[PDB]
Amino acid sequence: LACQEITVPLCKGIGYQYTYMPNQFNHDTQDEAGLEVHQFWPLVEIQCSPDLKFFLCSMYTPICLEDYKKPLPPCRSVCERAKAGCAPLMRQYGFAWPDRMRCDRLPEQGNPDTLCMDH
């Protein structure tokens, strides 16, 4: 995991500046991952959930630390907060919560195998 500075415009200033490739969706470049997070931009600007921008970026552009060389995904709570805030508005326009963004795939905090980030 060699850290690369984040160039995805939607994911700048989220809390961390470095990421790695490939991500959980097997995107080889940030430009490939950028094309999918920018498809979520209307939900992000409306601010249906304050955790939406961080949750999306924590998966498409996962944080990279040269000191801590282990992948750390977002905690389940981050996903469920973003879902509870935006999925009703999503359902109002006929769009369901993507299966790739299912919260059950993420680990809960307190997990012995992997560490996750939540404020």
Partner: protein, 91 residues
């Protein structure tokens, strides 16, 4: 006479407040919300719309930069009218 110059001074302070007022970014939030709603009603979430949706968001980020740039110039105007009031204080 001295009171009339004081009234001239409060006239300057009143006009400087309206001159220095910027408030561009507060107006920006309403615009971005209006555009984002239209993006949802047009079904930007998911053939041609994928390219269109990308072009709109990139322009919005440049707009947000320009708004932040215009907001910065408003402070420079606010700083200069403060120095002018100080120079007028010597009278």
């Amino acid at each position: 006479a001295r009171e009339q110059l004081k009234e001239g001074m409060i006239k300057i302070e009143e006009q400087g407040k309206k001159l220095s007022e910027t408030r561009t970014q507060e107006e920006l939030q309403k615009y971005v919300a209006a555009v984002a709603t239209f993006a949802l009603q047009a079904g930007f979430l998911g053939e041609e719309i994928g390219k269109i949706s990308g072009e709109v968001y990139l322009k919005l980020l440049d707009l947000k930069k320009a708004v932040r740039a215009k907001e910065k110039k408003g402070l420079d105007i606010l700083n200069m009218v403060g120095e002018i009031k100080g120079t007028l204080e010597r009278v």
